[PDB]
Ligand binder design. Structure first.
Ligand SMILES: COc1c(F)cccc1C(=O)N1C[C@@H](C)CC[C@H]1CNc1ccc(Br)cn1
Ligand SMILES: CCCCCCCCS[C@@H]1O[C@H](CO)[C@@H](O)[C@H](O)[C@H]1O
Ligand SMILES: CCCCCCCCS[C@@H]1O[C@H](CO)[C@@H](O)[C@H](O)[C@H]1O
Ligand SMILES: CCCCCCCCS[C@@H]1O[C@H](CO)[C@@H](O)[C@H](O)[C@H]1O
Ligand SMILES: CCCCCCCCS[C@@H]1O[C@H](CO)[C@@H](O)[C@H](O)[C@H]1O
Ligand SMILES: CCCCCCCCS[C@@H]1O[C@H](CO)[C@@H](O)[C@H](O)[C@H]1O
Ligand SMILES: CCCCCCCCS[C@@H]1O[C@H](CO)[C@@H](O)[C@H](O)[C@H]1O
Ligand SMILES: CCCCCCCCS[C@@H]1O[C@H](CO)[C@@H](O)[C@H](O)[C@H]1O
Ligand SMILES: CCCCCCCCS[C@@H]1O[C@H](CO)[C@@H](O)[C@H](O)[C@H]1O
Ligand code: NA
Length: 302
């Protein structure tokens, strides 16, 4: 029974090995590309004074939130996605999930303020002054808000023993509280800002593609930014939806195909980190100015 042997070889050995190879290579490729890429974003804006715009100051802040998640949270997520257990202790069970939620909040708030800045500059000019100095005040305000509103997330994280292994999970005293919290989390960090940004960029699209030199520069930046928002919305959609289906709709509680649930959650966690790697790649192709600084970086160190 050679066919039956090959089927158990595939199930018990070949498939789990290929799965671990794909998983580890995917997480390592994204960790490296995100660390290098986002460092280069910060260096491109620091080196060239002409790219020291309000948009690019917020793009640097997006890179900081993306570096926060890549450096601290990505290695922890990789180990949970391998073991399905917590190996970093009780203290880090509160800190790493908290820093991850802070990073999402900083990322989406940074995107909202870029949209807001572009919407006032293009659709409703001369009502609100937007300068580089005021961008640093708005950036500090983004961190202060994000650090505060994510404390409930830190408060619910618990590291509990289950063999003798630990699990880092949210502890809720009653069934109603996680439903209200995960509904609010989804609408505040995903749905409401992305719905508002889509409507703002649709208005900017109508104004720009409906002075000539300025509109040529504005069309290039608005095209890039629309691609960034679209890619953020696609990357954060599977995790945002899985968290609602789990916490609000009580899904994935049956263990019949536990491995299928782990794979959907793993791929969803990886898409969040893939976003940090994606943003500097988007600036490379949709910004000639970021393209120059990146081309100069590969000419120098490589
Ligand atoms: C974007 O969300 C996550 C991620 F990208 C990696 C791992 C987990 C998540 C996640 O589902 N959440 C829940 C959400 C309501 C707040 C943000 C995180 C917090 N939980 C975490 C985060 C990191 C690690 Br590692 C373990 N748990
Ligand atoms: C509870 C856990 C149940 C485990 C079910 C997943 S088995 C896995 O299913 C894949 C389907 O895509 C096949 O490719 C592989 O051969 C096989 O190893
Ligand atoms: C950049 C330097 C690398 C640091 C990586 C952090 C990993 C933490 S190990 C972790 O420490 C806990 C105490 O905090 C113990 O409870 C755990 O048993 C142990 O596994
Ligand atoms: C000055 C406000 S006029 C108003 O400006 C909006 C732009 O946000 C558009 O939606 C409407 O069509 C238009 O009537
Ligand atoms: C920048 C604002 C400062 C707040 C940062 C929150 C993360 C601290 S870790 C964690 O927070 C939980 C919630 O408060 C407590 O239950 C724990 O005892 C404590 O270890
Ligand atoms: C509108 C008012 C909003 C406040 C609601 C507070 C309800 C408490 S939930 C409770 O919080 C603890 C924090 O320490 C966790 O340890 C528990 O696991 C979790 O169940
Ligand atoms: C704005 C926030 C709204 C989010 C959606 C949550 C709706 C709760 S359904 C509700 O859950 C209770 C606790 O689990 C049960 O006692 C009830 O039988 C059931 O009807
Ligand atoms: C702290 C108090 C906790 C109470 C939790 C109950 C929440 C109400 S859910 C609501 O209950 C209705 C009953 O009239 C049903 O008709 C609806 O279908 C259902 O959605
Ligand atoms: C907002 C929807 S609340 C949600 O409604 C579902 C019905 O589709 C039930 O499965 C859950 O118990 C309840 O939490
Ligand atoms: Na991000």
């Amino acid at each position: 029974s050679e066919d039956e042997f090959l089927r158990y070889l595939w199930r018990d050995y070949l498939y789990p090995k290929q799965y671990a190879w794909v998983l580890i290579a995917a997480y390592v490729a994204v960790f490296v590309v995100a660390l290098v890429g986002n460092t280069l974003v910060c260096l491109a804006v620091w080196r060239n004074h002409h790219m020291r715009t309000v948009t690019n100051y917020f793009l640097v802040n997006l890179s900081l939130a993306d570096v926060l998640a890549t450096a601290i949270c990505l290695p922890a997520s990789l180990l949970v996605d391998i073991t399905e257990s917590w190996l970093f202790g009780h203290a880090l069970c509160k800190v790493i999930p908290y820093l991850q939620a802070v990073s999402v909040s900083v990322a989406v708030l940074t995107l909202s303020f870029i949209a807001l800045d572009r919407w006032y500059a293009i659709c409703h000019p001369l009502l609100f002054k937007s300068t580089a100095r005021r961008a640093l005040g708005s950036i500090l305000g983004i961190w202060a808000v994000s650090l505060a509103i994510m404390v409930p997330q830190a408060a619910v994280m618990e590291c509990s023993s289950v063999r003798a292994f630990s699990v880092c999970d949210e502890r809720w005293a009653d069934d109603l509280a996680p439903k209200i919290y995960h509904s609010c989390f989804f609408i505040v960090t995903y749905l409401a800002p992305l719905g508002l940004m889509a409507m703002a960029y649709f208005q900017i699209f109508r104004k720009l593609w409906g002075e000539v030199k300025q509109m040529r520069a504005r069309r290039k930046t608005a095209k890039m930014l629309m691609v960034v928002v679209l890619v953020f919305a696609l990357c954060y959609l599977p995790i945002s939806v899985l968290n609602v289906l789990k916490r609000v709709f009580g899904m994935f509680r049956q263990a019949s195909d536990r491995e299928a649930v782990y794979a959907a959650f793993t791929f969803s966690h990886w898409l969040v980190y893939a976003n940090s790697a994606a943003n500097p790649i988007i600036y490379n192709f949709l910004s000639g100015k970021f393209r120059e600084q990146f081309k100069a970086a590969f000419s120098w160190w490589l």
